[PDB]
């Protein structure tokens, strides 16, 4: 009875809470308190198989809990999110990739790079840039929009699929 513990990381404002709520609840949140760091559960059929997704949506806050601990420790895969209209959130990606390696003492962590807000026309990080970054970490790269649902399931299920490869 497989449950996958997914962790969503990235700079503030990139859409980590919106992606999670799109996937779990199928609507787009226009605002969501940046300090709310919860987990969200759902049962989905991925590639024809049912599973339990436990998704911790991080909020980088000096307030405390065990879930943000009990999960960054043994979350099995991480979504690293930036926004395609937010160069600074792309420049921070390497900070978050390094954090994950430290918290799991491994450079073999299941991981997907997500470029969110692809519905927005004022783009400053282009697809090639992001692809090159992903190809240098060894990881898939997925373009999403929490507003339109584009790529949203694909981000999360590719990560689940990477966790599957890793188990072997
Ligand atoms: N246009 C557009 N806006 C988005 C998208 N995803 C998130 N947003 C908006 O970006 C802002 C920050 O989103 P949020 O989920 O709170 O980011 P977080 O800080 O990573 O949790 C919110 O106002 C969202 O409505 C998207 O795919 N497209
Ligand atoms: Mg948030």
Residue numbers in the entry: 1 to 168
Authors' description from the paper:
The small GTPase RAS proteins operate as “molecular switches” that fluctuate between inactive and active states. These switches can be activated by the exchange of guanosine triphosphate (GTP) for guanosine diphosphate (GDP), which is promoted by guanine nucleotide exchange factors (GEFs). The H-REV107 gene is a known member of the class II tumor suppressor gene family that has been identified as a growth inhibitory RAS target capable of suppressing anchorage independent growth in vitro an in vivo. Here, we found direct interaction and inhibition between KRAS G12V and novel H-REV107 peptide.
For example, the most common KRAS mutation types are G12C, G12D, and G12V accounting for almost 83% of all KRAS mutations. The KRAS G12V (1–168)-MgGDP was obtained as a new monomeric crystal form that belongs to the hexagonal space group P63, with unit cell parameters a = b = 82.547, c = 40.804 Å, α = β = 90, and γ = 120°. The structure of KRAS G12V-MgGDP consists of five α-helices (α1–α5) and six β-strands (β1–β6). The folding type of KRAS G12V-MgGDP is an α/β doubly wound shape, which is a mostly parallel sheet with helices on both sides. The P-loop, and switch I and II regions in the structure are located in residues 10–17, 30–38, and 60–76, respectively. In this structure, KRAS G12V contains one molecule of MgGDP per asymmetric unit. Mg2+ bound to the OH groups of the S17 in the P-loop, T58 around switch II, and oxygen of the GDP β-phosphate. When the structures of our KRAS G12V and KRAS G12V-H-REV107 peptide were superimposed on Cα atoms, the root mean square deviation (RMSD) showed a difference value of 0.503 Å. The structural differences between the KRAS G12V and KRAS G12V-H-REV107 peptide are mainly in the switch I and II regions.
